[PDB]
Design a protein around this ligand. Structure first.
Ligand code: SF4
Length: 206
């Protein structure tokens, strides 16, 4: 089912990334430029999972390279976390999108639960390969992939969670997605940025 038959029997991240370029586990590979796999190494203690590559990631071939990734950089820096010692990835690896007339970018479209279940084999291979001590789930889509489709990120902020069905029983911290911190009132944004730094420190202190 899904991407599972496209996942090779290997923990090498480069072999997995190359294989993900050939994945047809769902329909998202057709309109996307390429598959966006995770960045970082197997020594990483912290795995971070977003929703999906955006417009910038789709053509950069790397995760979190747009404005959201730059805000995440500022949050990681304030939390004293070396990005090079992370493994950063997304719940689904193909960019889902539409264009609006007058647009300045391709608009990110939300992955269905079906596409998240289809791409999960890659996330399982990534966690199996990295064996992280803690997984940071950035946003509702990533959190639900591991904690259940009914999970609410807003109701468990800053909580160290552990679910049994998860490879390696790593600690899980669900937090806001950095793209949510790009817009809104300045005081709401600044308060929300501090909440993200707090959650990143909890994950680093696991
Ligand atoms: S989104 Fe995931 S499951 Fe769907 S085609 Fe891309 S890699 Fe395969």
């Amino acid at each position: 089912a899904g991407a599972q038959d496209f996942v090779p029997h290997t923990a090498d991240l480069a072999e997995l990334a190359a294989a993900a370029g050939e994945c047809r586990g769902c329909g998202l590979y057709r309109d996307a430029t390429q598959a966006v796999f995770g960045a970082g190494g197997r020594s990483a203690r912290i795995m971070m999972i977003g929703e999906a590559p955006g417009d910038k990631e789709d053509l950069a071939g790397l995760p979190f390279v747009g404005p959201a990734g730059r805000l995440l950089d500022r949050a990681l820096e304030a939390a004293d976390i070396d990005r090079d010692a992370l493994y950063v990835t997304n719940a689904v690896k193909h960019f889902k999108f539409t264009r609006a007339a007058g647009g300045k970018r391709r608009i990110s479209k939300t992955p269905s639960r079906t596409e998240v279940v289809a791409c999960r084999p890659w996330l399982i291979a990534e966690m199996t390969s990295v064996e992280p001590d803690v997984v940071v789930l950035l946003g509702a889509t990533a959190a639900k992939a591991l904690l259940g489709n009914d999970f609410r990120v807003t109701q468990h902020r800053g909580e160290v969670l552990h679910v049994d069905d998860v490879p390696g029983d790593p600690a899980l911290v669900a937090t806001v997605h950095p793209s949510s911190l790009l817009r809104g009132p300045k005081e709401e944004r600044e308060s929300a940025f501090a909440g993200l730094v707090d959650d990143l420190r909890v994950a680093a202190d696991v």
